[PDB]
Amino acid sequence: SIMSYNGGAVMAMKGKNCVAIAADRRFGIQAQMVTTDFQKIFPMGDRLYIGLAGLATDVQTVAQRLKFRLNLYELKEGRQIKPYTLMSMVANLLYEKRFGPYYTEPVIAGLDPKTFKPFICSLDLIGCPMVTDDFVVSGTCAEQMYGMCESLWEPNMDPDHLFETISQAMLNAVDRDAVSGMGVIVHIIEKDKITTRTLKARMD
């Protein structure tokens, strides 16, 4: 697909009091990879990231446009943004190109700014949001990560088993995948700190 023009896979997963987001490192054209350090996970303020997958043009574009609007909002109001507001903003920004659409599947993961309430959601390429409580996936490979997360997820998870669960899920579902691989980056965050680990993925 045109979504499979540059590969890509973003997994988010809600734990007990914490949220884990991961993506793949590979970038390249249809059969030819180029680099192993492409960025798809972006920090939008504190304890709140976003992931973008699909066409890398729209990835970097919408990342910059959302950063533009986010810094405008965060300077117009002294508080930091709430995740539902970010979801609505992404929905509006995608829906403005109702017929000129960006080819991306944004995934938002952030905690509550006031409490330690987690939040995950995902959208369509036209702006259909969807909040769940277990996991949201995007990118080219879907059914792989669906089967793995419906196989491995438990509701109430400490960050350690959360990390291991999302690690095994991403690794196996990527190793089965063809156009998306070449290293995995993992962001496992909580109220207290931000952890970023990288896995020894199969480079095949």
Binding site: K76, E77, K82, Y84, T85, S88, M89
Partner: protein, 232 residues
């Protein structure tokens, strides 16, 4: 029209803007009002005396909600007041379109004051002789914002605008304090409004709106006559 497009408001040798000062004087020659921010809610109250015994008190309403949780009163001229009310309505609903969340009162005052400031500078139009008193209970803490024809704005614990507003203000400073309830704020607001109004004050001379954390509320003359029937 032709689109002549020049502004009538230019600087004095003193550096003043005499049209804006005249507009403020025209505000000050208007109907009194009182607005008090209590510890849990905010009380708005105006003073509405009909010219004859022929007028009805069921058609024109001074106290006005902008959202379900943001009240808004004025002291000035209704024909300008309705215009900027409608502008604020459309503006707030554009915000609720974009963000899917109720607009905060500070954001209202930013945008409305920017529009009003734009009318102060743009071509040929007079400024609007209206002093707002915007309020609402957004995120627990309630707020109270006064604006003016100059496009500026403030934030008061309690204030007054209209006839003898300085006298009402000096009564407010001695009577009102930092911490009360909505009922005590209503009590002292009716006291400071009845300090300056005419002698015949009824359930229809005044119009009172409160601001719970449950939302904006516009009281009825039923509970006004429950309360303002010789509240002290």
């Amino acid at each position: 029209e032709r689109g002549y497009s020049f502004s009538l408001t230019t600087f004095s040798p003193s550096g003043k803007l005499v049209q804006i000062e005249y507009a403020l004087a025209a505000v000050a020659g208007g109907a009194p009002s009182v607005g008090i921010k209590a510890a849990n809610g905010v009380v708005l109250a105006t003073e509405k005396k009909q010219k004859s015994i022929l007028y009805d008190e069921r058609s024109v309403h001074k106290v006005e909600p902008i959202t379900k949780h943001i009240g808004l009163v004025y002291s000035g001229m209704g024909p300008d007041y309705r215009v900027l009310v409608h502008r604020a309505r459309k503006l707030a609903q554009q915000y609720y379109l974009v963000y899917q969340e109720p607009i905060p009162t500070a954001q209202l005052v930013q945008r409305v004051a920017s529009v009003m400031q734009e009318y102060t500078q743009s071509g040929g139009v007079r400024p609007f002789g209206v002093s707002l008193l915007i309020c609402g209970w957004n995120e627990g803490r309630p707020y109270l914002f006064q604006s003016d024809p100059s496009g500026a704005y403030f934030a008061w614990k309690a204030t007054a605008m209209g006839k003898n507003y300085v006298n009402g203000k000096t009564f407010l400073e001695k009577r009102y304090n930092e911490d009360l309830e909505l009922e005590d704020a209503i009590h002292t607001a009716i006291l400071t409004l009845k300090e300056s109004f005419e002698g015949q004050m009824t359930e229809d001379n005044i119009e009172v709106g409160i601001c719970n954390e449950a939302g904006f509320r516009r009281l009825t003359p039923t509970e006004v006559k429950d309360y303002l029937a010789a509240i002290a």
